[PDB]
Write a protein that binds this ligand. Structure first.
Ligand SMILES: *[C@@H]1[C@H](O)[C@@H](O)[C@H](O[C@H]2O[C@H](COS(=O)(=O)O)[C@@H](O)[C@H](O)[C@H]2NC(C)=O)[C@@H](C(=O)O)[C@H]1O
Length: 439
């Protein structure tokens, strides 16, 4: 008893071109305390990244960049050694991903940041290094006394400039991004205005979960539009118009403080994440970096070098995006969809010339039947993003297969989308996703 909706693809309604390095992950700087983590020896993790994209960005930063200290002299407080940086360069070579690297503006010195930046540029080098960032979420330094309550944008601008100047003496070509926090008017907007000639792009953060006074995030709420996201995105677009700076979402996940068990670690997070990737690409974002590491509730990839790594449910939403590939987004308008309002759809003219459609039936209790118009093709296939329940922590498949070890994945189920009268009809179960590819 599906809700029968229409989807109209318009090849003449041109949207943004998705860049090849749109995908990405965000990790804590403290991972850099174990040189076995981002290492050429970590073949498992490298394979999970390659499956997420042949190009992409690894962002390292997070709150642990308050208390992680580069020590050129070395072989809560964590230490980054030359060997760790050495090994990170090899990991970037194995993955093909670029790097956003956090420096310690919260507790470190400008001179040590210059020295760390110099060694990163010495060993990772300008091609692989996309940006340094000078502190993570500086607007929240006060929450744990990294700064006093009085710390404001002026104070941070003074810190930022001291660090930037010191770094640029050691590393004249050092690239920067900032301010590495969620859009706001008291920090991000003035950062862009003041430092637009000194940064390459704006780095923003986004957690679907709002302030902790909100009702605890639920799967139901995660599937719904987030008006705050829409507003912040519009703010970032206005910043880009005013300053020329593009924006990248350098730390995001469903819920903050490590994720919420029964939301962040579930199949719903795959639907959320995959949809968010497209939503933000359609809005003009240059890319995304889903935060994770360890066995946190929200991590895309869980595990350790000693015990092995696995793909968590959210990974599978990122995998759908990866399998779709890059290209130019096209108009894709839904109709007759008020009874299935959480279905989203995105159409893409792939770089290879083929039309694809990514659909996320985020309606938890409505199946849909989608009548697709605007595509002329002799053959459409679908790969489904599936789990038996929206809150499942396992049992997630894409294309009829789980992801295996080291990011291994290939589709095992072939399904054609029936075509007639120049249209296609696709059924989707409640709480499912689909990637269509047209011949
Ligand atoms: C973005 C932050 O930059 C990121 O560090 C943070 O996630 C980490 O910190 C959380 C809070 O810990 S504490 O209060 O600073 O000690 C912690 O709950 C998360 O587990 C931790 N994440 C990882 C992968 O280690 C996140 C967040 O989840 O809150 C964002 O604030």
């Amino acid at each position: 008893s599906p809700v029968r909706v229409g989807l109209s693809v318009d090849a003449s309604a041109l949207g943004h071109t998705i860049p090849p390095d749109y995908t990405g992950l965000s990790y804590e700087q403290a991972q850099m305390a174990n040189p076995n983590y981002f290492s050429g020896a970590n073949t498992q993790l490298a394979g999970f990244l390659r499956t997420l994209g042949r190009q992409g960005v690894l962002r390292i930063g997070g709150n642990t960049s308050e208390y992680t200290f580069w020590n050129r002299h070395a072989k809560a407080r964590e230490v980054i050694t030359p060997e760790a940086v050495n090994n990170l360069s090899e990991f970037l070579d194995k993955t093909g991903w670029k790097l956003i690297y956090g420096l310690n503006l919260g507790k470190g010195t400008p001179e040590n940041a210059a020295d760390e930046a110099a060694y990163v540029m010495e060993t990772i080098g300008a091609d692989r290094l996309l940006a340094f960032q000078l502190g993570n979420e500086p607007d929240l330094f006060y929450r744990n006394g990294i700064r006093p309550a009085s710390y404001d944008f002026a104070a941070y601008a003074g810190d930022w400039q001291r660090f930037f100047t010191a770094i640029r003496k050691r590393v004249p070509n050092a690239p920067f991004a900032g301010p590495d926090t969620a859009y706001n008017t008291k920090w991000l907007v003035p950062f862009a205005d003041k430092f637009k000639h000194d940064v390459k792009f704006i780095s923003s953060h986004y957690y679907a979960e709002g302030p902790p006074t909100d009702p605890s995030m639920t799967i139901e709420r995660l599937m719904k539009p987030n008006p705050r996201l829409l507003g912040e995105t519009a703010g970032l677009k206005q910043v880009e118009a005013d300053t020329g700076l593009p924006f990248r979402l350098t730390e995001t996940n469903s819920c903050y403080q490590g994720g919420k068990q029964g939301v962040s670690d579930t199949f719903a997070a795959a639907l959320w994440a995959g949809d968010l990737m497209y939503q933000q690409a359609a809005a003009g974002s240059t890319g995304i970096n889903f935060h994770g590491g360890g066995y946190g509730w929200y991590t895309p990839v869980a595990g350790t070098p000693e015990d092995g790594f696995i793909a968590r449910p959210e990974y599978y939403g990122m995998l759908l995006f990866a399998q779709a590939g890059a290209g130019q987004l096209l108009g894709a308008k839904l109709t007759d969809n008020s009874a299935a309002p959480l279905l989203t759809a995105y159409a893409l003219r792939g770089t290879d010339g083929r039309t694809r459609i990514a659909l996320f039936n985020k309606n938890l209790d409505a199946d849909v039947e989608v009548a697709i118009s605007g595509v002329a093709s002799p053959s459409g296939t679908v790969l489904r993003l599936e789990a038996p329940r929206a809150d499942d922590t396992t049992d997630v498949t894409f294309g009829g297969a789980p992801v295996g070890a080291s990011g291994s994945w290939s589709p095992l189920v072939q399904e054609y989308v029936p075509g007639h009268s120049g249209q296609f009809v696709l059924h989707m179960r409640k709480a499912s996703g689909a990637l269509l590819e047209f011949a």
